[PDB]
Amino acid sequence: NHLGKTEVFLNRFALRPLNPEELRPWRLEVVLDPPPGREEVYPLLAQVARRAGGVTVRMGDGLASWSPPEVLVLEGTLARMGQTYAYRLYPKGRRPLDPKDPGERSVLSALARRLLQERLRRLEGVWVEGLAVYRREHARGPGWRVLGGAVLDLWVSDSGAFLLEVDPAYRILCEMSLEAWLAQGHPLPKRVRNAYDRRTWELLRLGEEDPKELPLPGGLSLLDYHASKGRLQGREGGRVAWVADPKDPRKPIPHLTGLLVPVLTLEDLHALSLPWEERRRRTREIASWIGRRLGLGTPEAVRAQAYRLSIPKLMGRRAVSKPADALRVGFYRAQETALALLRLDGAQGWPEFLRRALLRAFGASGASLRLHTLHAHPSQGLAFREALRKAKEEGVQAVLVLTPPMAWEDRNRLKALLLREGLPSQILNVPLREEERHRWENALLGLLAKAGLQVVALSGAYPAELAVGFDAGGRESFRFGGAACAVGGDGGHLLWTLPEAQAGERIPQEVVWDLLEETLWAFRRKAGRLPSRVLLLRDGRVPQDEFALALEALAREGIAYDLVSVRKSGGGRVYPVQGRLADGLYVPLEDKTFLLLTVHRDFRGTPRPLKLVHEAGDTPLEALAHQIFHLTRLYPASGFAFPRLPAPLHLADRLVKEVGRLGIRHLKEVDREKLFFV
DNA sequence: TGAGAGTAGTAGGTTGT
DNA sequence: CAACCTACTACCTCG
Ligand SMILES: [Mg+2]
Ligand SMILES: [Mg+2]
């Protein structure tokens, strides 16, 4: 085509074709007593399956097995929703399954994965955790070690053969007491675990007290409490460590050092990247080895044809290579702006170099700049808000806050406090110093995006002149479904919309349509017309007919559309057969899905290609991939590294994250071109 | 709070039928 | 139940 071909390996491997015994599994009818309700029937079968033993999986309103009935537990009980059901399994012969059919293919894949897990459990001496296995020591030191292995998957192809997915992975384990850990000049860890069970404890203050002299409620002492439960049989008790429950907040419980064990994270190791060549090596090694342990034959690595998409041409006022360059060359679109400085460290006026850099920039862009300084501290209560309102009145559009590093709660409180008065903010943290150029340049880009300037845009010719991303965020049992967009054939404007509260991940049909409509209306305000075609991007999978209503409404306005499910995980891995690993690789797969490797640099380790599904619409793939790839480059708030996600989705995820953090109630007075969440 | 991917560690929560 | 989203923490860099 227009774009240049090459060939790649996937981290997938073809094994045997399925013989007929594997194609004619035992079928079983499940009889529950009493009968289950409609929502509970489906998971209870899964429950009956584990209790059934052997190698059995859910099938329809019944069971499928690769084990003969004689070694299953056909009669039993299973307690679930506080009701004890008696199950009886009734065998109904074997029956042929057809591999071309995605439903039965789903069952054969389930049966295969169960087969795999059971075959791994009987391996020795290797360490099994579900579908991940760890084989050798990658590292080790005084009291700790890192195991290495792979995460595995097994399923069945549309042509009825086994398929192996392999991806190297690491495990960190410690198996050392807290006392001994400290007794070798390590510092105190973040997290710790009971030596006698799984309970974690957030560690805190090691303590000066004594046990066999500390008093627990019940007349007993720490020492004799733990002694009583006999835990001081193997171990010896320690100093007196203090722990706070992980759910509980800052309540302190006592605890011997001799009975705690540190839990280690990455933070605690002062590789695991694996430059891609090594990962590819290891993947082939582990794959072939697994093939050998299993009665599945010789593993053959899967190849796919790949194409390199043209490199997008990024623009400020003139040609650019990174968004930080717009600081020197000028923005795509400049407007008359005013910015404020808030010093929370007890310092005085504007840092000089910042003033020089921005002034130079707005000079290049040919727009006028006015700089203000806010004289008030938030500790002044309501007068602080008064000063904020006064500032907004004087024309101020965004705020820079120079402060020592803030605790999250205080950070959120301040940000929000400015937001209710329509002031997006950029925090920058003192010390700073001019020679730390990247940090303060990225903060500066953030500031400009938050006052609504468009620092960069594209130069290509793309199929859709409006692109919109959708995601749900927030962590309090409810979420925020939100949308963000890039407007114009040039992506010349960036906008967000107010999210909506929802029960979970599924965005209601009418909500989808309303957010979409707001972006259409925005396009109407800029271009003076409706878009010929829009590109609709959903983060993660698109749930059944979630877009149906929005889609129909679009068809009704005479607007053409494309729906793309963009999945951040599950897309596996891609390694070139002989060249360099390059950015911007398009890899078509089955009929409507394809991979897209958008971001990569060598000092990061092996990339994680995105997986994309064209759920609806009739624009050709290649062009979809082309536009999405180019859109990954639009993000204005990262000066030196493009995000993996295309600009609308990266914005959407950051939007719902921020609304999920602060609240939605502050946004009533904040303009939609101002990206307060970056 | 500079922010980016890719890592593993913890703790969450949700969709399917 | 089963498989798979979100959110946070280092780190080293700076298309
Ligand atoms: Mg997200
Ligand atoms: Mg930010």
XYZ file of C-alpha atoms (C1' of nucleotides) and ligand atoms in Angstrom:
712
model
C 0.000 0.000 0.000
C 1.031 3.609 0.703
C 2.911 2.182 3.705
C 5.877 -0.162 3.991
C 5.577 -3.877 4.871
C 7.737 -6.022 7.215
C 7.096 -9.227 9.208
C 6.657 -9.898 12.869
C 6.283 -12.655 15.473
C 3.498 -12.678 18.031
C 3.921 -14.178 21.494
C 1.610 -16.970 20.289
C 2.484 -20.523 19.359
C 0.639 -23.189 17.346
C 0.466 -26.674 18.859
C -1.339 -29.896 17.941
C -4.710 -29.940 16.251
C -7.405 -31.222 18.581
C -7.966 -34.983 18.305
C -11.530 -36.333 18.548
C -11.619 -37.274 22.258
C -10.759 -33.657 22.984
C -13.540 -32.654 20.517
C -16.135 -34.966 22.113
C -16.071 -34.023 25.836
C -18.416 -35.437 28.405
C -21.609 -33.382 28.870
C -23.460 -33.198 32.176
C -26.803 -31.867 33.386
C -26.682 -30.094 36.746
C -29.493 -30.483 39.234
C -29.558 -28.003 42.054
C -31.720 -28.477 45.100
C -33.277 -26.021 45.688
C -33.346 -24.392 42.203
C -31.275 -21.150 41.928
C -32.503 -17.676 40.951
C -31.776 -16.268 37.470
C -28.639 -14.302 38.354
C -27.156 -16.992 40.589
C -27.718 -20.020 38.341
C -24.901 -19.110 35.955
C -22.120 -18.623 38.613
C -23.313 -21.579 40.710
C -22.529 -23.909 37.845
C -19.007 -22.560 38.002
C -19.135 -23.359 41.690
C -20.426 -26.881 40.904
C -17.502 -27.239 38.454
C -14.712 -26.730 40.996
C -16.558 -28.873 43.522
C -17.035 -31.447 40.740
C -13.281 -31.846 40.622
C -11.312 -33.135 37.671
C -11.092 -31.065 34.533
C -14.515 -29.545 34.145
C -15.871 -26.223 32.936
C -19.254 -24.518 32.651
C -21.356 -25.434 29.584
C -24.708 -23.881 28.805
C -27.097 -24.648 31.652
C -24.818 -27.622 32.417
C -21.210 -28.889 32.547
C -18.424 -29.945 30.112
C -15.625 -32.288 31.130
C -12.393 -33.714 29.808
C -12.555 -36.108 32.700
C -14.710 -39.211 32.683
C -17.557 -39.174 35.255
C -16.059 -41.947 37.451
C -13.545 -39.548 38.981
C -15.953 -36.670 39.536
C -17.818 -35.880 42.751
C -21.367 -36.258 41.413
C -23.151 -35.719 44.744
C -22.429 -32.868 47.082
C -23.288 -29.545 48.672
C -22.172 -25.984 47.991
C -22.907 -23.000 50.255
C -23.052 -19.654 48.464
C -25.658 -16.927 48.975
C -26.188 -18.123 52.561
C -28.146 -21.079 51.290
C -26.795 -24.559 51.015
C -27.620 -26.180 47.706
C -27.272 -29.871 47.145
C -26.057 -30.600 43.678
C -26.327 -33.793 41.773
C -24.555 -34.218 38.462
C -26.153 -36.400 35.807
C -23.880 -37.567 32.955
C -25.334 -37.322 29.419
C -22.720 -38.922 27.159
C -20.041 -37.256 25.066
C -20.937 -34.766 22.333
C -18.977 -33.260 19.414
C -18.057 -29.613 19.630
C -17.383 -27.461 16.554
C -14.235 -25.183 16.619
C -15.427 -22.712 13.943
C -18.330 -21.698 16.210
C -17.168 -18.976 18.687
C -19.411 -20.269 21.515
C -18.146 -23.868 21.500
C -14.712 -22.414 20.700
C -15.131 -20.451 23.937
C -15.856 -23.723 25.780
C -12.966 -25.657 24.215
C -10.652 -22.762 25.173
C -11.952 -22.914 28.739
C -11.421 -26.655 28.898
C -7.903 -26.192 27.505
C -7.000 -23.515 30.026
C -8.258 -25.773 32.890
C -6.177 -28.588 31.368
C -3.151 -26.322 31.404
C -3.597 -25.261 35.036
C -4.011 -28.893 36.182
C -0.962 -29.998 34.179
C 1.134 -27.217 35.724
C 0.060 -28.052 39.325
C 1.853 -31.376 38.985
C 5.100 -29.800 37.928
C 8.062 -29.758 40.191
C 9.928 -28.077 41.417
C 8.586 -24.935 39.832
C 6.426 -22.295 41.391
C 2.863 -22.128 40.140
C 0.446 -19.170 40.701
C -2.583 -19.760 38.509
C -1.552 -19.369 34.888
C 1.875 -18.001 35.757
C 4.856 -20.278 36.379
C 8.299 -19.315 37.734
C 11.384 -21.435 36.930
C 14.815 -19.846 37.633
C 16.464 -17.146 39.806
C 17.060 -13.917 37.893
C 18.408 -12.284 40.997
C 19.318 -12.901 44.574
C 20.979 -11.308 47.590
C 21.385 -11.358 51.325
C 17.973 -12.671 52.257
C 15.897 -12.134 49.134
C 15.372 -13.408 45.629
C 13.599 -12.707 42.356
C 12.136 -15.639 40.467
C 11.583 -15.573 36.724
C 9.117 -17.361 34.510
C 6.214 -16.675 32.252
C 2.535 -16.049 32.297
C 0.834 -18.613 30.100
C -2.454 -19.077 28.282
C -3.888 -21.931 26.272
C -6.899 -21.729 23.991
C -8.350 -23.231 20.805
C -8.206 -21.622 17.355
C -11.039 -21.135 14.845
C -9.449 -23.961 12.859
C -9.496 -26.329 15.885
C -5.905 -26.457 17.132
C -4.281 -25.567 20.458
C -2.742 -22.062 20.919
C -0.108 -21.084 23.504
C 0.493 -17.542 24.727
C 3.753 -16.976 26.649
C 5.047 -13.808 28.214
C 8.010 -13.644 30.555
C 7.178 -12.305 34.017
C 8.914 -11.869 37.343
C 8.085 -12.523 41.014
C 9.685 -10.865 44.063
C 9.688 -12.839 47.321
C 11.565 -12.164 50.580
C 11.083 -14.852 53.310
C 13.076 -13.012 56.066
C 11.965 -11.652 59.436
C 11.495 -7.936 59.969
C 14.125 -8.090 62.707
C 16.727 -9.831 60.518
C 15.863 -7.575 57.615
C 16.601 -4.516 59.711
C 19.497 -6.470 61.278
C 21.278 -6.179 57.933
C 21.061 -2.424 57.470
C 18.082 -2.395 55.185
C 15.704 0.426 56.181
C 12.106 -0.070 57.340
C 9.766 -1.273 54.525
C 6.428 0.194 53.450
C 4.539 -3.126 53.858
C 4.829 -6.162 56.140
C 3.094 -9.573 56.580
C 2.452 -12.012 59.436
C 4.993 -14.840 59.492
C 2.156 -17.164 60.551
C -0.535 -16.194 58.011
C -1.392 -13.972 55.011
C -2.621 -10.849 56.869
C -0.738 -7.788 55.655
C 0.029 -4.849 57.926
C 1.102 -1.370 56.951
C 4.258 -0.934 59.107
C 5.127 2.325 60.776
C 7.108 3.115 63.877
C 9.516 0.551 65.210
C 9.198 1.040 68.995
C 11.239 1.486 72.202
C 8.798 -0.521 74.441
C 9.335 -3.955 75.960
C 7.125 -7.045 75.559
C 6.711 -9.498 78.452
C 5.974 -6.071 79.938
C 3.667 -4.448 77.352
C 0.030 -4.836 78.179
C -2.635 -6.256 75.932
C -6.313 -6.066 76.880
C -7.025 -9.193 78.931
C -4.223 -9.123 81.503
C -1.866 -10.723 78.979
C 1.286 -9.204 77.496
C 2.405 -9.057 73.792
C 4.994 -11.716 74.334
C 2.649 -14.066 76.170
C -0.205 -13.364 73.759
C 1.808 -14.500 70.737
C 3.438 -17.255 72.860
C 0.023 -18.566 73.869
C -0.942 -18.962 70.181
C 2.532 -20.578 69.849
C 4.201 -18.644 67.098
C 7.371 -18.227 69.069
C 8.129 -21.860 68.544
C 10.005 -21.564 65.306
C 10.846 -17.866 65.451
C 12.124 -15.738 68.329
C 10.248 -12.531 69.177
C 11.676 -9.154 68.219
C 11.782 -5.480 69.133
C 8.299 -3.934 69.456
C 7.165 -2.938 65.973
C 4.000 -0.914 65.367
C 1.489 -1.654 62.704
C -1.587 0.049 61.270
C -4.319 -2.108 59.669
C -4.424 -1.545 55.892
C -8.141 -0.721 55.769
C -8.048 1.084 59.138
C -6.647 4.592 59.229
C -3.588 5.352 61.366
C -4.756 3.322 64.341
C -1.754 1.619 65.886
C -1.466 -2.002 66.937
C 1.584 -3.513 68.615
C 3.484 -6.426 67.076
C 6.720 -8.331 67.491
C 9.471 -7.841 64.929
C 10.230 -11.529 65.078
C 6.838 -12.352 63.629
C 6.655 -9.902 60.782
C 8.056 -10.322 57.287
C 8.580 -7.482 54.789
C 6.579 -7.433 51.560
C 8.796 -6.082 48.787
C 7.832 -3.915 45.849
C 9.881 -2.322 43.093
C 10.357 0.739 45.279
C 12.402 -1.459 47.570
C 15.141 -2.411 45.087
C 17.628 0.421 45.595
C 16.460 -5.146 35.354
C 12.789 -6.294 35.035
C 12.627 -4.126 31.972
C 14.146 -6.617 29.589
C 15.103 -4.840 26.419
C 12.969 -6.371 23.726
C 15.616 -8.597 22.163
C 16.154 -10.437 25.445
C 12.393 -10.767 26.101
C 11.945 -12.269 22.631
C 14.782 -14.710 23.339
C 13.307 -15.787 26.680
C 9.808 -16.136 25.183
C 11.015 -18.603 22.583
C 13.001 -20.544 25.173
C 10.102 -20.882 27.637
C 7.603 -21.635 24.915
C 9.585 -24.524 23.524
C 10.211 -25.891 26.983
C 6.465 -25.834 27.846
C 5.691 -27.543 24.573
C 8.042 -30.245 25.751
C 6.550 -30.706 29.242
C 3.035 -30.894 27.741
C 1.806 -33.608 25.388
C 1.086 -30.868 22.864
C 3.838 -31.277 20.300
C 6.283 -28.834 18.817
C 5.509 -25.148 19.270
C 5.555 -23.051 16.122
C 5.822 -19.274 16.508
C 3.110 -17.314 14.735
C 3.952 -14.745 12.031
C 1.942 -11.726 10.869
C 2.427 -9.167 8.123
C 3.088 -5.664 9.572
C 3.185 -2.144 8.002
C 4.983 1.056 9.087
C 2.658 4.040 9.123
C 3.948 7.370 7.910
C 5.449 9.579 10.551
C 3.053 12.329 11.589
C 4.145 15.926 11.034
C 3.605 17.864 14.269
C 2.903 21.635 14.185
C 3.201 24.654 16.427
C 3.298 28.083 14.764
C 5.791 26.327 12.455
C 7.257 22.811 11.991
C 7.989 20.937 15.220
C 9.432 17.640 16.588
C 8.038 17.668 20.173
C 5.383 19.708 21.975
C 8.045 21.402 24.170
C 9.385 23.046 20.978
C 6.226 25.206 20.638
C 7.692 27.173 23.535
C 10.353 28.391 21.080
C 8.414 28.400 17.811
C 4.874 29.465 18.786
C 1.502 27.741 19.123
C -0.935 26.521 16.487
C -3.501 28.975 17.921
C -2.780 31.855 20.318
C -5.271 34.048 22.218
C -5.032 37.081 24.539
C -4.152 35.560 27.930
C -3.521 36.464 31.586
C -1.849 34.152 34.155
C -1.429 34.329 37.953
C 1.305 33.310 40.423
C 0.579 31.945 43.883
C 3.540 31.392 46.138
C 2.780 29.010 49.023
C 6.304 28.612 50.355
C 6.686 32.081 51.809
C 8.645 33.378 48.816
C 7.943 36.544 46.776
C 7.350 37.405 43.118
C 7.759 35.705 39.738
C 10.658 33.379 39.113
C 12.570 35.236 36.390
C 13.454 32.425 33.927
C 9.857 31.253 33.738
C 8.784 34.795 32.886
C 11.513 34.989 30.207
C 10.607 31.653 28.643
C 6.826 32.290 28.482
C 7.159 35.930 27.365
C 9.506 34.796 24.600
C 6.909 32.175 23.643
C 3.894 34.508 23.495
C 6.145 36.848 21.536
C 6.694 34.105 18.940
C 2.976 33.326 18.865
C 2.170 37.018 18.330
C -0.339 37.179 21.199
C -0.434 39.511 24.159
C 0.371 38.286 27.676
C -0.396 39.802 31.103
C 1.138 38.350 34.292
C -0.468 38.814 37.777
C 0.610 37.694 41.268
C -1.806 36.529 43.941
C -1.125 37.971 47.364
C -3.024 35.738 49.836
C -2.604 32.371 51.527
C -5.454 29.801 51.644
C -5.018 29.800 55.423
C -6.932 33.109 55.345
C -10.222 31.262 54.846
C -12.889 33.188 52.967
C -10.715 36.196 52.103
C -8.634 33.860 49.971
C -11.722 33.032 47.861
C -12.464 36.790 47.714
C -9.012 37.395 46.253
C -9.559 34.552 43.757
C -12.866 36.060 42.531
C -11.183 39.474 42.222
C -8.437 37.876 40.118
C -10.943 36.200 37.795
C -12.657 39.591 37.404
C -9.339 41.236 36.420
C -9.193 38.838 33.460
C -7.036 36.044 34.889
C -7.514 32.700 33.097
C -5.304 30.152 34.947
C -3.104 29.798 38.011
C 0.442 28.676 38.743
C 0.996 27.475 42.289
C 4.627 27.242 43.506
C 4.589 25.154 46.652
C 6.533 22.605 48.633
C 5.317 19.049 47.911
C 1.748 18.575 49.201
C -0.048 15.631 50.742
C -2.838 14.390 48.421
C -5.770 15.542 50.589
C -4.375 19.075 50.847
C -3.493 19.034 47.093
C -7.047 18.063 46.136
C -8.517 20.656 48.530
C -6.467 23.477 46.996
C -6.990 22.492 43.355
C -10.743 22.218 43.952
C -10.837 25.517 45.879
C -9.327 27.246 42.817
C -11.635 25.332 40.423
C -14.899 26.546 41.954
C -13.714 29.998 40.986
C -12.936 28.811 37.471
C -9.196 28.551 37.974
C -7.430 25.435 36.675
C -4.053 25.107 38.345
C -0.613 23.756 37.726
C 1.470 22.787 40.790
C 5.267 22.997 40.361
C 7.053 22.243 43.706
C 9.953 24.200 45.230
C 13.187 23.880 45.128
C 13.065 23.837 41.266
C 16.213 25.679 39.953
C 16.661 26.679 36.263
C 18.948 23.821 35.286
C 16.140 21.308 35.843
C 14.758 22.355 32.480
C 12.504 19.429 31.550
C 10.378 19.509 34.681
C 9.463 23.204 34.610
C 9.042 23.152 30.803
C 6.450 20.335 31.155
C 4.724 22.244 33.932
C 4.646 25.320 31.710
C 2.991 23.337 28.865
C 0.454 22.102 31.388
C -0.259 25.673 32.483
C -0.935 26.769 28.912
C -3.218 23.866 28.147
C -5.094 24.747 31.375
C -5.667 28.328 30.221
C -6.920 26.910 26.934
C -4.176 27.724 24.430
C -3.674 25.171 21.668
C 0.021 24.519 21.701
C 0.080 21.887 18.887
C -1.878 20.348 15.938
C -1.389 17.915 12.945
C -0.665 18.316 9.200
C -1.881 15.093 7.635
C -5.109 14.402 5.765
C -7.474 12.277 7.870
C -10.851 10.479 7.203
C -12.645 11.876 10.315
C -12.658 15.584 11.203
C -13.864 14.991 14.778
C -12.369 12.460 17.224
C -13.870 11.562 20.585
C -12.735 9.312 23.456
C -14.822 7.692 26.217
C -13.869 6.223 29.643
C -15.137 5.582 33.158
C -13.196 6.463 36.313
C -13.419 6.965 40.070
C -13.036 4.331 42.718
C -15.877 4.744 45.176
C -18.245 1.908 44.072
C -19.641 4.279 41.429
C -17.931 5.804 38.434
C -17.859 8.787 36.134
C -18.409 8.212 32.471
C -16.816 10.986 30.530
C -15.709 12.067 27.120
C -12.979 14.249 25.670
C -12.409 15.384 22.095
C -10.126 16.755 19.381
C -11.918 19.069 16.947
C -11.015 19.973 13.358
C -9.181 18.311 10.494
C -6.080 19.739 12.118
C -7.138 18.849 15.659
C -7.033 22.612 16.195
C -9.186 22.573 19.350
C -9.250 20.359 22.475
C -12.356 20.091 24.686
C -13.829 18.068 27.598
C -17.441 17.443 28.749
C -18.957 17.118 32.275
C -18.916 13.439 33.187
C -21.972 11.615 34.529
C -22.221 9.374 37.574
C -22.954 5.753 36.804
C -23.096 2.460 38.699
C -20.187 0.826 36.949
C -18.269 0.651 33.687
C -21.223 0.572 31.320
C -22.126 4.034 30.048
C -25.932 4.424 29.630
C -27.034 4.775 25.964
C -28.517 8.266 26.462
C -25.395 9.430 28.335
C -23.204 8.319 25.455
C -25.344 10.204 23.067
C -25.434 13.393 25.227
C -21.646 13.634 25.597
C -21.333 12.968 21.868
C -23.896 15.665 21.071
C -21.992 18.211 23.117
C -18.893 17.494 21.072
C -20.897 17.822 17.804
C -22.271 21.139 18.955
C -18.728 22.244 19.814
C -17.633 21.380 16.242
C -20.610 23.398 15.065
C -19.362 26.401 17.040
C -15.811 26.201 15.564
C -16.383 25.162 11.913
C -19.922 26.442 11.425
C -21.236 23.056 10.296
C -21.698 19.399 11.195
C -18.771 16.994 10.681
C -18.779 14.786 7.614
C -17.579 11.857 9.744
C -16.646 11.223 13.381
C -14.257 8.751 14.972
C -15.630 7.175 18.125
C -13.094 5.682 20.542
C -14.033 3.621 23.556
C -11.440 2.777 26.232
C -11.583 -0.948 26.823
C -14.264 -3.073 25.234
C -17.535 -1.668 23.905
C -20.342 -3.423 25.860
C -23.265 -4.767 23.762
C -25.215 -2.011 21.948
C -23.899 0.643 24.361
C -23.576 2.972 21.375
C -26.660 1.802 19.507
C -28.721 4.886 20.325
C -25.904 7.354 19.663
C -25.116 5.492 16.481
C -28.706 5.639 15.211
C -28.955 9.352 16.065
C -25.780 9.952 14.053
C -27.179 8.035 11.088
C -30.231 10.289 11.421
C -28.211 13.513 11.182
C -26.556 12.325 7.984
C -23.239 11.998 9.815
C -20.982 9.000 9.053
C -19.141 7.312 11.917
C -16.573 4.818 13.164
C -16.589 2.859 16.427
C -13.338 1.509 17.747
C -12.827 -0.567 20.869
C -9.222 0.203 21.940
C -7.952 -2.352 24.411
C -4.810 -1.541 26.433
C -4.229 -5.120 27.455
C -4.874 -8.472 25.872
C -3.218 -7.343 22.681
C -0.132 -9.447 23.458
C 3.407 -8.782 22.128
C 5.063 -8.093 18.748
C 8.694 -8.757 17.858
C 10.283 -8.062 14.486
C 11.763 -11.100 12.720
C 14.924 -9.315 11.674
C 14.941 -5.502 11.847
C 14.941 -2.815 14.533
C 11.887 -2.359 16.700
C 10.250 0.754 15.336
C 7.433 2.982 16.422
C 4.091 3.129 14.562
C 3.525 -0.487 13.538
C 0.118 -1.581 12.145
C -0.608 -5.327 12.379
C -3.882 -6.619 10.900
C -5.316 -9.844 12.339
C -8.668 -11.499 11.811
C -11.432 -9.691 9.852
C -12.264 -6.669 12.133
C -9.428 -6.532 14.688
C -5.793 -5.369 14.470
C -2.789 -4.339 16.617
C -1.178 -0.921 16.740
C 2.241 -0.284 18.337
C 2.149 3.480 18.903
C 4.859 4.385 21.364
C 8.332 2.967 21.953
C 11.809 3.936 22.994
C 14.732 1.575 23.742
C 15.408 2.633 27.313
C 11.902 1.534 28.316
C 11.869 -2.156 27.690
C 9.485 -4.172 25.521
C 6.333 -2.349 24.217
C 2.723 -3.423 24.788
C 0.819 -3.121 21.509
C -2.746 -1.859 21.659
C -5.522 -4.071 20.333
C -8.230 -2.446 18.273
C -11.582 -3.663 17.113
C -13.658 -1.969 14.479
C -17.076 -2.468 16.083
C -19.069 -0.409 13.568
C -18.544 1.850 10.555
C -17.091 1.502 7.087
C -13.776 3.442 6.967
C -10.858 1.109 5.976
C -8.646 -0.197 8.777
C -5.377 1.193 7.616
C -6.777 4.640 7.670
C -8.260 4.170 11.125
C -4.915 2.959 12.393
C -3.203 5.866 10.606
C -5.397 8.485 12.273
C -5.207 6.940 15.746
C -1.417 6.699 15.548
C -1.174 10.324 14.503
C -3.529 11.298 17.359
C -1.226 9.763 19.952
C 1.008 12.708 19.142
C -1.438 15.520 19.864
C -1.102 15.490 23.595
C 0.130 19.003 24.515
C 0.935 18.476 28.195
C 3.773 15.948 27.660
C 6.772 17.734 26.164
C 9.173 14.871 25.548
C 7.245 11.614 25.321
C 4.097 10.791 23.466
C 1.395 8.923 25.395
C 0.540 5.380 24.395
C -3.104 6.330 24.099
C -4.434 8.642 21.410
C -5.060 12.173 22.639
C -8.850 11.923 23.113
C -8.625 8.787 25.266
C -5.625 9.932 27.271
C -7.572 13.108 28.028
C -10.726 11.206 28.821
C -9.010 8.868 31.276
C -7.212 11.822 32.958
C -10.554 13.723 33.081
C -12.568 11.010 34.801
C -9.605 10.376 37.127
C -9.600 14.012 38.220
C -13.385 14.257 38.566
C -13.221 10.990 40.513
C -10.640 12.660 42.800
C -12.056 16.177 43.403
C -15.742 15.992 42.672
C -17.954 17.209 39.890
C -19.436 20.123 41.878
C -16.557 22.573 41.253
C -16.784 22.518 37.501
C -19.926 24.570 37.195
C -17.777 27.651 36.499
C -14.911 26.098 34.440
C -14.618 26.608 30.636
C -14.543 23.435 28.510
C -11.409 24.367 26.472
C -9.346 24.487 29.717
C -7.770 21.092 30.478
C -7.760 21.347 34.304
C -6.900 17.646 34.737
C -3.407 17.293 33.138
C 3.049 17.880 42.567
C 6.469 17.072 35.083
C 5.220 13.366 32.724
C 5.928 9.425 29.730
C 6.056 3.591 29.077
C 6.926 -0.518 31.312
C 7.593 -3.064 35.258
C 5.533 -5.780 40.031
C 3.268 -4.997 44.425
C -0.837 -4.034 46.916
C -6.128 -3.354 46.979
C -10.070 -2.433 44.573
C -14.148 -3.011 41.612
C -16.992 -4.843 37.431
C -19.111 -7.835 32.928
C -20.528 -11.956 31.168
C -24.395 -15.835 30.996
C -17.103 -18.161 40.183
C -13.988 -16.452 35.817
C -11.406 -12.793 33.349
C -10.317 -8.533 33.055
C -10.925 -2.780 34.292
C -9.031 1.201 37.576
C -5.450 3.645 40.807
C -1.377 4.098 43.249
C 4.108 3.485 44.180
C 9.055 3.591 42.619
C 12.245 3.979 39.202
C 15.164 6.817 34.271
C 14.649 9.355 31.243
C 13.721 13.534 28.206
C 10.694 11.567 19.873
Mg -8.687 5.027 32.494
Mg -1.032 17.019 36.107
